[PDB]
């Protein structure tokens, strides 16, 4: 294992200033800081460890106050020591989710500057899909060390000690192990990470410089309006029990909205056809294709719609605001999505239905707080924008360059008639395609959603590359350079690895084929994305006008913005998301505000 003799514990100012000085000479060392909470604005900091050379690491506990915990330097001279080393640019820190402590030290009035390394999104860049980023999981596959698990110094369930119960010695281990495994992994890491310019790239201009900027978002939360959410809940359960009634009335006697048990006794019992529906969904649901004529699977769609909805947004929301900010802290995950792309939970802001009423009365209660107002920026189909990039198409390129509705446009080509007549049945099916494209749906997929026959959805994909070859070759091209290195990269170097790309197995090798298009359009996205909360971030910090980037979902992000300067911000924002980031996609930038989030979107 790893006993009391591996790392020391610095007990005394002495050894701490001793320390303090072999770190700034150091060319880097790993920090890491340990807290009473996993909410980080409300965590307590109980010990901050650092490492200066592999093997090489202490642990400063400054809060352990269990019974008779021996004297410690206090938290705020280790902080006042340790202050102009953390706020030093020029001192490189190398850590795991550098995120969270920069958080932590922030509680104290402290700006940790030199975020060099995270070896979570070192881990991340080199190869995403290679499995879990965390310290754990990373010990063991680059450095075959099993390390000290939190469970194992802290216990499990609701009698598991937090930090500053745990004992010096033993709080010691962990931390200073952590330290250690975080600088070594680096050292494995970040030689690897040159092999290649471009998850270099990605890495050092992309991933690094946005982690002060997801704790920033993170820590400055969004306020949600509990009582807005309480009354559509309330509403909700009046709905729900309507919905009900209506259900019961439709058919005879009571029964749950439970499919393939009382619906289908029902449904088809009463004429239709015998395969029921899927909550396989998305392609396959026969309780909506009965909607447009059948009213009881409709309502059975609307009941278990809104029944979701409920537990998860209305019910859950008002129970994550913060009692100390009296705001929700969102958790972004900057290592988790195969493609690059931020994902959130705790709310995840991205599954709060879009294109739905419900869903845009969940936005309505993400206010503004006084004097200040929702301002919602957007790329406007920017995947599909890359797409038009990626295929060098000129018609779809000259149609983004025009300003025409593309998916009409598209339609005008595929079908082939004015612009100005393209019905809504014909730009639905040009939609299907566009964004059928984006995800390499098959043929028969497309017919799926559109409802039309298999062959006549093939019929509107061939016409599709006729009339927009370049896609075809791009989607070939992409597809050939998987195969042969294995992987596909994003304008910015971005790698998504396909392993089951030459899988010699059927649906497998085929999702990988999916992915090794999408992947290039969704990635591209992500970067730009993340490249314009860095740029739009520096802005906030450097001008520090009177606006807060207060969330990041599918392609915008919202701020708040003081009423009296929403027009000089909003030009602003707008300038440097799609004019700060690649100067090559054709960006387009949707800014829009109001009293909330639904209002701003
Ligand atoms: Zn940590
Ligand atoms: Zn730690
Ligand atoms: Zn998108
Ligand atoms: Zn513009």
Request: proline share 3%.
């Given at each position: 294992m790893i006993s009391y003799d591996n790392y020391v514990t610095?007990?005394?100012?002495?050894?701490?200033?001793?320390?303090?000085?072999?770190?700034?000479?150091?060319?880097?060392?790993?920090?890491?800081?340990?807290?009473?909470?996993?909410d980080n604005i409300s965590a307590n900091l109980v010990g901050l460890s650092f490492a200066i050379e592999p093997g090489v690491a202490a642990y400063i506990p400054?809060?352990?106050?269990?019974?008779?915990?021996?004297?410690?330097?206090?938290?705020?001279?280790?902080?006042?020591?340790?202050?102009?080393?953390?706020?030093?640019?020029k001192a490189?820190?190398?850590?795991?989710?550098?995120?969270?402590?920069?958080?932590?030290?922030?509680?104290?009035?402290?700006?940790?500057?030199?975020?060099?390394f995270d070896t979570m999104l070192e881990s991340y860049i080199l190869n995403s899909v290679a499995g879990r980023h965390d310290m754990d999981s990373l010990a063991e596959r680059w450095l075959k060390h099993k390390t000290i698990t939190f469970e194992e110094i802290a216990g499990k369930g609701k009698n598991q000690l937090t930090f500053n119960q745990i004992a010096l010695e033993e709080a010691g281990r962990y931390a200073a192990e952590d330290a250690d495994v975080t600088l070594q992994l680096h050292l494995k890491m970040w030689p690897d990470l040159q092999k290649h310019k471009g998850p270099l790239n990605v890495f050092e201009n992309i991933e690094m410089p946005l982690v002060p900027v997801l704790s920033r978002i993170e820590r400055n939360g969004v306020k949600i309006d509990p009582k807005v959410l309480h009354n559509h809940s309330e509403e909700l359960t009046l709905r729900l029990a309507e919905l009900e009634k209506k259900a019961h009335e439709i058919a005879g006697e009571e029964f749950n909205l439970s499919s393939t048990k009382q619906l289908q006794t029902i449904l088809f019992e009463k004429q239709g056809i015998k395969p029921l529906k899927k909550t396989p969904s998305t392609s396959e649901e026969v309780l909506e294709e009965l909607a447009l004529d059948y009213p009881l699977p409709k309502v059975i769609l609307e009941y278990r719609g809104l029944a979701k909805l409920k537990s998860t947004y209305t019910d859950k929301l008002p129970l994550m605001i913060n009692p100390k900010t009296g705001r929700v802290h969102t958790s972004y995950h900057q290592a988790v999505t195969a493609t690059g792309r931020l994902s959130s939970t705790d709310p995840n802001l991205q599954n709060i239905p879009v294109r739905n009423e419900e869903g845009r009365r969940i936005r309505q209660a993400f206010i503004a707080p006084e004097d200040y107002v929702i301002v919602s920026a957007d790329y406007s189909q920017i995947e599909l924008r890359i797409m038009a990039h990626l295929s060098r198409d000129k018609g779809l390129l000259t149609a983004f360059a025009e300003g025409k509705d593309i998916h009409r446009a598209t339609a005008a080509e595929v079908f082939g008639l004015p612009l100005e007549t393209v019905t809504s049945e014909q730009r639905r099916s040009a939609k299907a395609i566009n964004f059928g494209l984006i995800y390499g749906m098959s043929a028969f997929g497309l017919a799926r959603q559109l409802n039309i026959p298999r062959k006549e959805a093939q019929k509107y994909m061939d016409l599709y590359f006729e009339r927009y070859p370049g896609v075809l070759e791009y989607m070939e091209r992409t597809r050939a350079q998987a195969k042969e290195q294995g992987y596909v990269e994003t304008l910015d170097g971005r790698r998504l690895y396909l392993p089951d790309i030459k899988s010699s197995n059927?649906?497998?090798?085929?999702?990988a084929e999916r992915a090794a298009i999408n992947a290039p359009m969704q990635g591209t996205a992500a970067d730009i994305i993340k490249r314009a909360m860095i740029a739009v971030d520096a802005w906030l910090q450097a001008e520090q006008?009177?606006?807060?980037?207060?969330?990041?979902?599918?392609?915008?992000?919202?701020?708040?913005?003081?009423?009296?300067?929403?027009?000089?911000?909003?030009?602003?924002?707008?300038?440097?998301?799609?004019?700060?980031?690649?100067?090559?996609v054709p960006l387009l930038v949707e800014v829009g505000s109001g009293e909330n989030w639904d209002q701003a979107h």
């Open positions: 610095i007990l005394d100012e002495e050894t701490l200033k001793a320390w303090i000085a072999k770190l700034e000479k150091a060319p880097v060392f790993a920090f890491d800081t340990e807290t009473d909470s996993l400054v809060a352990h106050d269990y019974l008779d915990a021996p004297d410690q330097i206090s938290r705020e001279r280790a902080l006042e020591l340790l202050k102009p080393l953390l706020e030093d640019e490189l820190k190398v850590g795991q989710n550098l995120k969270y402590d920069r958080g932590i030290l922030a509680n104290y009035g402290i700006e940790l500057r030199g975020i060099a059927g649906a497998r090798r085929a999702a006008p009177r606006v807060r980037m207060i969330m990041q979902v599918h392609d915008e992000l919202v701020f708040e913005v003081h009423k009296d300067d929403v027009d000089a911000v909003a030009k602003q924002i707008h300038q440097l998301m799609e004019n700060c980031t690649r100067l090559d």
